[PDB]
Design a protein around this nucleic acid. Structure first.
Lengths: 267, 148, 54, 204, 89
RNA sequence: AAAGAAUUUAAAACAUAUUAGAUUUAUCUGAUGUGUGAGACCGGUGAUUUCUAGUUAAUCCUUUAAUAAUAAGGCUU
RNA sequence: UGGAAGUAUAAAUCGAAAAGGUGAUAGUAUUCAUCAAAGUCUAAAUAUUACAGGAAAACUGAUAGCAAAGAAGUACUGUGAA
RNA sequence: AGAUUUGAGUAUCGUAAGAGGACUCCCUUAACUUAAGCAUAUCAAUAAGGGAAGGAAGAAAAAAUAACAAUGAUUUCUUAAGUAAUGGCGAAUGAAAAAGAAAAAGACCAAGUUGAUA
């Protein structure tokens, strides 16, 4: 074997030894520990989006990014100025990539907001926010009542149909096709009526007094992706006759035929 | 283990195992891969006959990520789910649930055709397929999907 | 120089499982230079209640 | 705004009006000491853009430099070198004349800090610059939050280390990306890191 | 079910979401361009361009413009401003 | 001529139109409809791929976002 | 410089803009994608065989270990660097 | 005579110098050596020479990657990798996106507007 060793240069002054590696672990750990002692959510590792990797090699894997786009904060009804102060990363540099990416990170912020508990800026009970929260209790109860009332009627069909399909799969695993067809028809009708409604621009920051349950980060509480189990499908006759090779070669040959089309039209 | 080398079994022998006529001098024909065409040519001819020259076109900035396409043959498809799942659905046909062996989740993109498949229907979800791979999957009673 | 050495983890556990199992043999335990003539059982296990008061 | 017509005007250097003015200025600077102080910048738009502010502690210095290329400083052009290093002419300095001139003002004015410099004019022999200097111990500079960063001790002889814009373009910090692979955070520091032979504590 | 990996229509089915902003000048930069032009005039090479354009040698103007600007596309943008000045007198 | 549901609710570019405030210039800057760009079919429709017969165009590979004509690099002698 | 019809810097000449740069095979054209240069500051994660204060060691044990275990860069040599 | 512009001397209050340079940022066109000779190449941002600082310094907020189900300031570590490429295509030299982590933070000038203007 032909050897290829780049030792002709002075490697003895290029040698780096890792004798400080055991002491690096103690130093970093004593900084994380002493950071929470200052204020525990200081090391909370502010929430980050669920972004895809790049290239077709990794395109199916989700991973944490940095900062939600200003469209994701608006979709989740979060002030972009207040986001940085409640442990949320913000990345104005990130242009939105897809609708499916906007929805997933809008749910990530929505789920995080419900878990988030914001202590008052002033500990004393005479703070404005605590005082104002007692100044709108009667209005909140009236506001809450109608929200539940008018949400209890719009879902009176989807909820019952979803209940029906849930039991249909049970008796099919302890008929089924009717419930799925029936459920899908209801879903289209509901989405049709929504298109045929100005909402709140910003939500309320959840501010309350509570015992200090101190958590070291928020990206571990909200998992990136749901666990994957075995998937199964109904083998119809249409899938049996799908020609994958012909579909791939047609797509390859069509892209390789653009040259002839331009060549022909240019003569 | 310095006590296990040949230096400890050659203490007393004058030449230390290197010969008296031909001493152990500094160099034995150059420093490195010297004389590739002059005096070590018979070495390169014998053991690396295509070491010298050029072949193929230069790729100025090669994108090795665009050539990453892991492949799995048909005979190894059912190992992706398991042997118990294979026997569970061993008596299915058209109309009933058949497990879907999606290979992208397992890191395989192209499905190749080699070996034999169990006589059961199956749904193979993969980015690319081979011409002889699709035949074996369909001859057994299954389907070949596509992804991405 | 190369002070610290590397060993596969599964080979490390193979030796420990072969070293715990070797402590239940009084012939090997005594041969190592241990006075275990008067012990009741060679896998000497003590109550967790007695330990908690030490 | 007045300073938007001046900026558009100053880009027409080949114009007769601007060529006459540069002709007069280059005459005066040839019969003055090489480094000297001027009352106010002669290009107030360019001076203001680079950082000059008409406040106490901000001074302007003019330096005249002899442009063109010099020979390799070897006696009688005799170098005991291999043919690959035997050239005496055609060898160009890595540091731009602007960076070179900025250092001469810095050494001459050791009690101040060099901020930036801009081109003034040139002739067949000389090229003239104008250097913006700041006094770090002025109470106005110290008490201004937006400019007291220059009071940091690491800013002593700023142009000598290569922190001014004129001296940082010669270092290669003109852009980003794959064109500037070797000049990531410093050409020599990047080279040392790439050449490090990491000997891990536990290695095969 | 889950698109295709080859061809023009390739990739996972998804609704892609980018503004094409135009960096340009305002309507007052027209005035600033004229005011400076009167106060300065034309460069030495610009004037030689005007002479060539007057005698109807448009190709020789572009070659001269390329020689002093180093870009085919920037040569056209100068051969248009110069030829526009001829129609403005 | 023969096989063919195709996957499922939070949207930005503006090709265009109609208005609002301005400029005369290689003229712009706002706001509201519309389609685009949309995809949830009801044993039959069918988007979509085969096979046969002509015609038309391209036909050794590459310049790594896509083409073209120059140029250059590949492979064999 | 790995950057190959030029990756970066500098010098001589030349020199823009009703903007424009990049998509590393030079050239023109039409699309597409992605940024918006030529001013400034910015903690944290990283380096350390000056020097000072400590702790360790499968290190050496007075021809060994620093040149130096005592008034060691000392005695002594040279015009001097040493 | 007066209103300005520029340039000086003097007084007062401060500022620079010198030591150290193990680590940091740079200027300079060394050679021995290797190629079994040698002249490009290697040695090699290496030695010597020169400048400047701090407890760290440098860099830092895209005229950046990529061609994807896309990312997203700087720095450092793992990997890509002795790979693409460079080379009397000889000897030899040789990165980077992606991907995994440590730490995380963004702010201003100029230009533009407001002028009983400060």
């Amino acid at each position: 074997a032909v050897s290829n060793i780049h030792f002709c240069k002075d490697w003895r002054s290029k040698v780096h030894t890792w004798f400080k590696q055991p002491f690096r672990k103690i130093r970093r750990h004593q900084t994380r520990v002493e950071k929470a002692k200052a204020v525990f959510p200081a090391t909370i590792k502010s929430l980050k989006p669920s972004v895809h990797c790049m290239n077709q090699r990794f395109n199916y894997k989700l991973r944490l990014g940095r900062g939600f786009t200003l469209k994701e904060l608006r979709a989740a009804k979060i002030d972009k100025n207040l986001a940085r102060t409640i442990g949320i990363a913000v990345d104005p540099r990130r242009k939105e990539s897809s609708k499916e990416c906007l929805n997933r990170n809008a749910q990530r912020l929505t789920e995080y907001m419900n878990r988030l508990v914001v202590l008052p800026k002033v500990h004393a009970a005479t703070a404005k926010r605590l005082v104002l929260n007692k100044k709108n209790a009667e209005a909140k109860t009236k506001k809450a009542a109608e929200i539940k009332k008018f949400i209890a009627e719009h879902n009176k069909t989807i909820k019952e149909l979803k209940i029906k399909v849930a039991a249909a799969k049970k008796d099919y695993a302890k008929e089924l096709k009717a419930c799925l067809k029936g459920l899908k028809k209801a879903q289209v009708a509901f989405a049709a009526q929504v298109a045929k409604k100005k909402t709140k621009q910003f939500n309320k920051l959840p501010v309350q007094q509570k015992e200090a349950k101190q958590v070291l980060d928020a990206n571990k509480v909200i998992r990136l992706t749901a666990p994957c189990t075995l998937e199964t499908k109904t083998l119809t006759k249409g899938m049996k006759a799908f020609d994958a090779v012909a579909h791939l070669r047609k797509a390859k040959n069509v892209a390789k035929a653009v040259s002839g089309i331009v060549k022909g039209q240019k003569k | 283990a310095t006590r296990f080398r040949q230096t400890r079994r050659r203490r007393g022998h004058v030449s230390m195992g290197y010969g008296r006529i031909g001493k152990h001098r500094k160099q034995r024909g150059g420093r490195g891969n010297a004389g590739g065409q002059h005096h070590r040519k018979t070495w390169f001819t014998t053991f690396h006959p295509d070491y010298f020259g050029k072949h193929g076109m230069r790729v100025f900035h090669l994108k090795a990520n665009k050539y990453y396409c892991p492949s799995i043959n048909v005979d190894s498809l059912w190992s992706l789910v398991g042997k118990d799942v294979q026997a569970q659905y061993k008596n299915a046909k058209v109309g009933e649930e058949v497990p879907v062996i999606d290979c992208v989740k397992h890191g395989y993109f192209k499905v190749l055709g080699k070996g034999f498949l169990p006589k059961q229907p199956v749904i193979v979800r993969a980015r690319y397929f081979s011409e002889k791979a699709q035949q074996k999957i369909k001859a057994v009673g299954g389907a070949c999907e596509l992804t991405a | 120089r190369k002070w610290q050495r590397k060993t596969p983890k599964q080979m490390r556990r193979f030796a420990v499982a072969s070293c715990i199992a070797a402590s239940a043999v009084p012939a090997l335990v005594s041969a190592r230079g241990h006075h275990i003539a008067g012990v009741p059982q060679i896998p000497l296990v003590v109550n967790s209640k007695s330990i908690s008061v030490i | 705004g007045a300073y938007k017509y001046i900026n558009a005007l100053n880009r027409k250097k080949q114009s007769d009006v601007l060529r006459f003015l540069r002709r007069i200025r280059c005459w005066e600077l040839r019969h003055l000491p090489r480094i000297h102080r001027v009352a106010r910048p002669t290009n107030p738009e360019r001076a203001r853009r680079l950082g000059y502010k008409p406040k106490s502690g901000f001074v302007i210095y003019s330096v005249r430099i002899h442009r063109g290329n010099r020979k390799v400083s070897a006696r009688k052009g005799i170098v005991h070198r291999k043919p690959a290093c035997q050239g005496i002419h055609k060898i160009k300095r890595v540091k731009s004349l602007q960076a070179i001139a900025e250092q001469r003002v810095g050494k001459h004015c050791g009690a101040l800090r060099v901020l930036n410099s801009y081109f003034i004019g040139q002739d067949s022999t000389y090229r003239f610059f104008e250097v913006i200097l700041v006094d770090p111990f002025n109470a106005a500079i110290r008490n201004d939050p937006k400019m007291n960063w220059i009071c940091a001790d690491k800013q002593k002889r700023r142009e000598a280390r290569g922190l001014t814009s004129a001296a940082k373009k010669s270092r290669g910090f003109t852009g980003k990306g794959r064109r500037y692979n070797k000049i990531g955070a410093g050409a020599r520091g990047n080279l040392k890191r790439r050449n490090l032979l990491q000997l891990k504590r536990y290695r095969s | 079910m889950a698109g295709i990996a080859v061809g023009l229509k390739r990739g996972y089915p998804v609704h892609t979401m980018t503004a094409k902003r135009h960096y340009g000048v305002t309507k007052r930069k027209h005035v600033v361009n004229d005011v400076i032009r009167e106060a300065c005039g034309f460069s030495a090479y610009e004037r030689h361009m005007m002479d060539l354009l007057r005698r109807g040698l448009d190709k020789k103007a572009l070659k001269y413009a390329k020689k002093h600007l180093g870009t085919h596309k920037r040569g056209l943008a100068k051969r248009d401003e110069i030829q526009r000045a001829l129609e403005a007198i």
